[PDB]
Every structure is written in structure tokens, then in C-alpha cells.
Amino acid sequence: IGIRLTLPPPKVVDRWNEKRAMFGVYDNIGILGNFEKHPKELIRGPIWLRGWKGNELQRCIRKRKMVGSRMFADDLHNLNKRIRYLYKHFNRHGKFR
Amino acid sequence: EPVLRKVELPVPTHRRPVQAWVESLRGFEQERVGLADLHPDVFATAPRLDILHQVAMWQKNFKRISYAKTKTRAEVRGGGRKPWPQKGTGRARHGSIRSPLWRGGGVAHGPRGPTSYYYMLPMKVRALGLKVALTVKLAQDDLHIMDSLELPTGDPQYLTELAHYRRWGDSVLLVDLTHEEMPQSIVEATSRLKTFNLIPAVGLNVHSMLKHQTLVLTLPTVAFLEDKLLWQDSRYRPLYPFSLPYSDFP
Amino acid sequence: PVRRSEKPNWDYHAEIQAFGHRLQENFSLDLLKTAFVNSCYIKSEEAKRQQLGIE
Amino acid sequence: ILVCPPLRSRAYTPPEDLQSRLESYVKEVFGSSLPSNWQDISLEDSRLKFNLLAHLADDLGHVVPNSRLHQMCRVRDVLDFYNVPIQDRSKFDELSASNLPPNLKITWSY
Amino acid sequence: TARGTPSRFLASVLHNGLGRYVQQLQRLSFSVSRDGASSRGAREFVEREVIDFARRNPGVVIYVNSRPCCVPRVVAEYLNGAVREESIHCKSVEEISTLVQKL
Ligand SMILES: [Mg+2]
Ligand SMILES: [Mg+2]
Ligand SMILES: [Mg+2]
Ligand SMILES: [Mg+2]
């Protein structure tokens, strides 16, 4: 048997949150702020992907480039192995060559 | 006395400008205190729900970073050795526990690392979206223009009663200029309300204008928006970023 | 099972009119109501009112 | 101290002397002459456009919105606009008010 | 499958066509929502074609409840005690009209 026998607790959502009400504000800041700031500079997150989309292999390569010197030892070993595997997969395997 | 507002920017030969009432927040019934006209290229462009959806989806998705991640069959603890050799018993061939076929194994095609969804629409497209949203707000009787946002009392219930009496709506986006000339009265009144949102002109955006039922600008905000959105037309190629001198560009 | 009059969608006058209309006849409305009343119903109603003390 | 004025209905109905009232207010705003066509004078001058429209709104309780305000170039345009009359009754109440057949009942959970 | 489903013989209710034909449909009850994208076809059906349907056949009693619902519905009740419930969820006005005429 897989279904729950009861209804899950009703999940209320505050649509007029501070965050939800202020979402999108100060976008278009370059367009109507004399281009002093780019909207890509409003992005918060990892240092290796701010204003950058990239592939998965591209993301791994960029992370090892930008922040791979102050990474943990096991994490960096994992990143190196992932880059190796991804290189092999994206360069030797699949349809469409 | 009446306050009449014209368009400073050059309206083209055809396309006579559009009109709008100028109101105030000082009085409770102080409607129709003046009359303004608005540039047709900004406030009367084509509907363009295509562009509205484009800009709204860009605003939703360009800043998103997804931190979901799984472990592949190489990052799961253990699993180095081959259990129960290949040919002996009557069990299926396996070269490792932690393979995706195993309970506790790695995920074959799960999410990988922090993923970014960054892309940019052309700034001409985004400015077109802004003009389109302003045009829609005017065309659907959802735009109100004030001489200035000023309240005699400065309390939230006054502003709520004023909006209800003027039949604006439930959610009101008030727009001012420079974030520093915002008067203490409206700042105090709006800092407590939930569906009344005070933003400077620099923060105007398609997502906020669509999320709020009514848009309430001021006359200096109207002129500022007109200038900034019109500059995108009749502009050269960049040739380098517009944060650099560009003699006539402030 | 319960009466149809005890269920949500019920308007007695509309039901009577539709009944009369469906067999393609022109009934007198009051006469039809009289024909649908019953004696035992009246006795039950008066017993209820006399036991509740309401006139 | 100035709390809660009562709300006003959106229902409007033009009077019978509407032509005469528009005539009188046009003279009182313009100060000009009738001779040929009082129903054909333009309103490119925003000052007298404002005065005419604000006086009409104050008198009749009906104010031209901005979308229609864009497209009023002649006083006959506002003359046509003031023969709209609209009603501010709920769709639910108008559904009741319509000549409903005796075999159609409408209830309400609002 | 016939071997996996019930069966019956062709029959009338009360010898309908022998004397006078009578409309076997007794009631139509509509649950439609004030707001809600799924009740838009039902909303316009109530706006336009429900009045004409009621005037067309007066042997049927039609109720419209107008309550908040995610799935608008029509319940058809027949002279022989049969009850049938249909979903008019996200249906066009022509679809709803065909459905009620079939009912
Ligand atoms: Mg290993
Ligand atoms: Mg075996
Ligand atoms: Mg192996
Ligand atoms: Mg696991």
C-alpha cells in the first residue's frame, strides 16, 4: 500500500510576503539607472557561477578553476574524477558525432 | 489652481499623445487635480503579451540558482570491491555496491551541483516590455498619476480607506523617485501595509506591475520613465558599455 | 433513505409546477397542493406543535 | 478627523436637459459664440479640456476614465460618452432581476 | 467487456410512447463557481443558454447553486429515481449545451 490514509496538513502560502511582494524590484537597474549596475550583479550565490550559465562539465571546470585551491581534499578529488568522467562521456560517447 | 503636464520629449508627427488625470493623496476626495499628457510611444504601444511573458519569465528565471545535488556512483561511501565473483553462484552480475541498481547506491541522472539559469534578454527587448506593461496599465484603467504622494495624517488605515473609496483595487504599487525624496508620511503609512508597496522609479519592473493590481506613479516619475524608455529608441550601437563617458549620455 | 424534500436542491412550488407541466395538463395549483396533502401529515404536524407548545 | 466618507455607486443615467447643460457649461467655460456648431469645437487646449471635463464630472458624478480621456477631441465625443448609461448592480442581482422562468432557481454561497 | 459488466433488456420506463410521451428528465442541478478558470464555460452557459433551455422544456426543474468549486458539475435526476452526475470542468459552452441536451 502506498497512499497516505489521511490528508496532509493544509499548507498556507503568504503571497504578500516581504520577498514575494518585493520580487523583481531593482531589476532593470542598468536600463533605468544609467547603466551604473548590471542586473547580473544582483545575483547571489556561488563565486564560480554568478552571471554565468555553463554546462555541467563547464561548471565543474569553472569551479575547479576559480575555487578549487581552497576546497577540501576529498571534495577536490571528487571534482577531478568528475571532470575526468565528464570529459570522457562528452567527448567519446553518445549519438551524433 | 490646475496643474497641466505636457510632454517634453519630441512626440512624432502623427501619434498625438495620450491623456490621463492628475490626482493627489492630500485630500480624501481630491481627484482630478490637474491633467497630464503622456508620450504615445511609451503609454500607447502595441499590447504585446508575447513581450510581457518574455520579460516576466526572464525576471523569474535569470537570477535562479538551484542548489539541489545528488551523489553519483563514485561519491557514495564504499563500493570499491566487487561482491560475489562474476561466474560462480546463481546471482546477477555486479561489480560494485553503490551502483544505481542498488538500495543506497548512486543516482544515475540526478541533479548536479549548484546550477545557474542565467541569461539576458536584449535591453531593447526589456525596455519594450516595460513600455508594454505601462501601456497595458493605462489601457485597462489601472494607471493613476499623482502630482506627489503626500498624506495629511500618515497612517496605514487612511491610505487603505482612500484606495477603497477610489476603487483602485487590492494591491497598489506606488512609484516615487530617487528613494530619498520619498516623504515621511507615505513612507510611514506604507511600511506597515502588506499589499501597498512603495518603490523608487529605478525599481519599476514587469513582475511587480503585473503582481500589483494598480500602478500609481508621480509626474516626475512619468517624465523620468518617458525619458529612460525613449532613449532606447534612436540610440546608436554601444561600441563600448554605457557606463563610460559617452559625451551626451549622463 | 430520506425524502427528496430533505435534500439540498428542492423548491416545492417549482416542483409542483414542473409536475403539472410535464404531463401536458393544466392543473389548478391550489387544488394540486390539496391533492398532495394527507391527513396523517396534518395529524403529525398538529401533534408536533402541541408537543412543542407553539401555536 | 476626516474618517470614512460613504462609497458612491458607479451607476449613471443621463438627465433630460443634458443638451442644455452641456450648452450652458460650454459657454461658461469658453466665453465664445455659438454661431455655426457648438457641438464641433475642439479641445486640444488641455486647460479648457480640464475645466469642461471637471465641471461635467462634478455636476453629473460621472468622470471620464483615462483610456476614453485619450480619445476626446470634440465636445460631441463627450456628448456621446454621456449617453452610455451603465449600471453598478452585480451580475448576480441582474440574473435575479431578469425574467427568470418559474422552473429556474438560483442560490448563492457568497 | 460484456462478460465483465452487467446487462439488461431494451425497455421503457412507464410505456412512454404508448400514450403521451413524457420527458423523463426531472431535475438538473448545476454547481458553478463565481471565480475559477474551470467554471468559465458553465459561467457563460448560465449567462446565455440556461434560460432558453428552461423555457424550452418546463417539465425540468433547473437549480444553479453558484458555490466555490474546483470542478463544476451537473447532476441529472430522472423520473425513475436514477441519478447521474457529470463534470462540466473546463468545457466549452457548446460542449455543455450538447451535454445538457443529451441529458
Ligand atoms: Mg570508489
Ligand atoms: Mg537462480
Ligand atoms: Mg565494474
Ligand atoms: Mg543514497
Choose among B59, B218, B214: nearest CA to A31. Answer: B59
3-state secondary structure at position D19: helix
Q: Are strands B143-146 and B18-23 parallel, antiparallel or unpaired?
A: parallel
D57 to chain B, any CB pair closer than 8 A? The answer is yes
With CA atoms as reference, the chain C residue closest to E29 would be C9
- Chosen for mutation from B117, B178, B205, B226 (greatest number of chain A CBs closer than 10 Å) is B205
All three cell numbers of A74, joined, read 576529498
How far CA D90 is from CA of B34, D9, D64, D94, in Å, comes to: 32, 11, 22, 6
- Ligand with minimal distance to B89 CA: 2
d(CA B76, CA B71): 6
Give the side-chain half-sphere CA count within 13 A for B116: 24
How far CA E101 is from CA of C5, E20, E49, E95, E97, in Å, comes to: 26, 20, 11, 10, 6
Of residues B204, B242, B250, nearest to A28 (C-beta): B204
D45 to chain B, any CB pair closer than 8 A? The answer is no
What amino acid occupies position B23? E
With CA atoms as reference, the chain C residue closest to E24 would be C22
What amino acid occupies position D48? L
Method: cryo-EM
Taking CB atoms within 8 Å and a gap of at least 24, the contacts of E7-15 are: E13/E79, E13/E80, E14/E79
All three cell numbers of B32, joined, read 482630478
D97 to chain E, any CB pair closer than 8 A? The answer is no
Angle (deg, nearest 10), helices C29-36 and C12-22: 110
d(CA B129, CA B114): 30
DSSP string, E22-76: ---EEEEEEE--SS-GGGHHHHHHHHHHHHHHHHH-TTSEEEE-----SS-EEEE
Per-residue 3-state assignment (H helix, E strand, C coil) for D20-87: HHHHHHHHHHHCCCCCCCHHHCECCCHHHHHHHHHHHHHHHCCCCCHHHHHCCCEHHHHHHHCCCCCC
Choose among D56, D22, D58, D65: nearest CA to D41. Answer: D22
A28-A29-A35-A41 Cα dihedral, nearest 10 degrees: -100
All three cell numbers of D42, joined, read 475642439
Residue found by looking up cell 504622494 in the block: B149
DSSP state of D2: -
Cβ separation B195–A25 shorter than 8 A: no
Residues B241 and A30 sit within 8 Å (Cβ to Cβ): no
Q: List chains touching E (3+ CB pairs under 8 A).
A: C, D
Domain spanning E1-103 has what CATH number?
A: 3.40.30.10
Taking CB atoms within 8 Å and a gap of at least 24, the contacts of B49-53 are: B51/B125, B51/B128, B51/B129, B51/B132, B52/B129, B52/B132, B52/B133, B52/B136, B52/B206, B52/B210
3-state secondary structure at position E87: strand
Residue found by looking up cell 551541483 in the block: B113
A84: which chain B residues are within 8 Å (Cβ-Cβ)?
none
φ, ψ for residue D21, nearest 5 deg: -65, -45
d(CA E82, CA B127): 61
- List the domain boundaries for chain E: 1-103
- Ligand with minimal distance to B93 CA: 3
Give the burial class of B174: count Cβ atoms within 10 A of its Cβ; 0-12 exposed, 13-18 middle, 19 or more buried: buried
C-alpha gyration radius of chain C: 14
φ, ψ for residue B217, nearest 5 deg: -100, 175
φ, ψ for residue E62, nearest 5 deg: -115, 125
D49 to chain B, any CB pair closer than 8 A? The answer is yes
Residues D43 and D70 sit within 8 Å (Cβ to Cβ): no
Per-residue 3-state assignment (H helix, E strand, C coil) for chain B: CCCEECCCCCCCCCCCCEEEEEECCCCCCCCCCCEEEECHHHHCCCCCHHHHHHHHHHHHHCCCEECCCCCCCCCCCCCCCCCCCCCCCCCCCCCCCCCCCCCCCCCCCCCCCCEECCCCCCHHHHHHHHHHHHHHHHHCCCEEEECCCCCCCCCHHHHHHHHHHHCCCCCEEEEECCCCCCCHHHHHHHCCCCCEEEEEHHHCCHHHHHHCCEEEEEHHHHHHHHHHHHHCCCCCCCCCCCCCCCCCCC
With CA atoms as reference, the chain A residue closest to B211 would be A21
Residues D59 and D25 sit within 8 Å (Cβ to Cβ): yes
Cβ separation C17–E63 shorter than 8 A: no
Write down how long chain C is.
55
H/E stretch holding A65: helix A56-67
d(CA D3, CA B153): 11
Taking CB atoms within 8 Å and a gap of at least 24, the contacts of E35-38 are: E35/E68, E36/E68, E36/E69, E36/E70, E36/E72, E37/E90, E38/E70, E38/E71, E38/E72, E38/E89, E38/E90
C17 to chain D, any CB pair closer than 8 A? The answer is yes
DSSP state of A42: G
Question: How many other C-beta atoms are found inside a 10 Å radius of the C-beta of residue D25?
Answer: 16
A75 to chain B, any CB pair closer than 8 A? The answer is no
CB pairs under 8 A between B and D: 51
Cβ separation D105–C21 shorter than 8 A: no
How far CA B162 is from CA of A67, B165, B172, B184, D87, in Å, comes to: 54, 5, 12, 18, 23
d(CA E37, CA B184): 42
**Sign of the four-CA dihedral B98, B99, B105, B109:** positive
DSSP state of A80: H
All three cell numbers of B58, joined, read 526572464
Are chains A and E touching, using the cut-off of 8 Å on CB pairs and a minimum of 3 such pairs? no
How far CA E49 is from CA of C42, E87, E94, E98, in Å, comes to: 42, 18, 10, 11
Domains of chain B: 1-250 (3.40.1370.10)
Q: How far is the CA of B107 from the centre of ligand 1 (A)?
A: 14
3-state secondary structure at position D105: strand
Residues in a beta bridge with B32: none
Residue found by looking up cell 554601444 in the block: B238
d(CA B14, CA B17): 9
Give the burial class of E72: count Cβ atoms within 10 A of its Cβ; 0-12 exposed, 13-18 middle, 19 or more buried: buried
**Start-to-end Cα distance in chain A:** 46
3-state secondary structure at position E85: strand
Sheet of strand B35-38: strand arrangement: B4-5, B35-38, B18-23, B143-146, B214-218, B172-176, B196-200
**Start-to-end Cα distance in chain B:** 34
Residues B71 and A78 sit within 8 Å (Cβ to Cβ): no
Write down how long chain B is.
250
d(CA D106, CA E51): 11
H/E stretch holding E86: strand E83-87
With CA atoms as reference, the chain B residue closest to A25 would be B203
Residues B177 and B214 sit within 8 Å (Cβ to Cβ): no
All three cell numbers of E88, joined, read 462540466
All three cell numbers of D78, joined, read 463627450
With CA atoms as reference, the chain D residue closest to B160 would be D4
D50 to chain B, any CB pair closer than 8 A? The answer is yes
d(CA C13, CA C29): 9
Q: List chains touching B (3+ CB pairs under 8 A).
A: A, D
A30: which chain B residues are within 8 Å (Cβ-Cβ)?
123
Residues in a beta bridge with B217: B145
Choose among B42, B215, B213: nearest CA to B132. Answer: B42
DSSP state of A23: T
Those of residues 67-106 in D touching chain C at CB distance below 8 A are: 102-103, 105
3-state secondary structure at position D106: strand
**Sign of the four-CA dihedral B201, B207, B211, B215:** positive
All three cell numbers of C43, joined, read 395529524
H/E stretch holding E99: helix E93-102
- Alpha-helical runs (H) found in C1-55: 12-22, 29-36, 39-52
All three cell numbers of A11, joined, read 499548507
Cβ separation D105–C14 shorter than 8 A: yes
Residues B178 and B170 sit within 8 Å (Cβ to Cβ): no
C14: which chain D residues are within 8 Å (Cβ-Cβ)?
102-103, 105
With CA atoms as reference, the chain C residue closest to E19 would be C23
C-alpha gyration radius of chain E: 16
B241: which chain A residues are within 8 Å (Cβ-Cβ)?
35
Q: Are strands B214-218 and B172-176 parallel, antiparallel or unpaired?
A: parallel
Are chains D and C touching, using the cut-off of 8 Å on CB pairs and a minimum of 3 such pairs? yes
d(CA B110, CA B162): 53
Sheet of strand D104-106: strand arrangement: D104-106, E61-64, E25-31, E73-78, E83-87
Q: Are strands B4-5 and B65-66 parallel, antiparallel or unpaired?
A: unpaired
d(CA B104, CA A21): 42
All three cell numbers of E57, joined, read 422544456
C14 to chain D, any CB pair closer than 8 A? The answer is yes
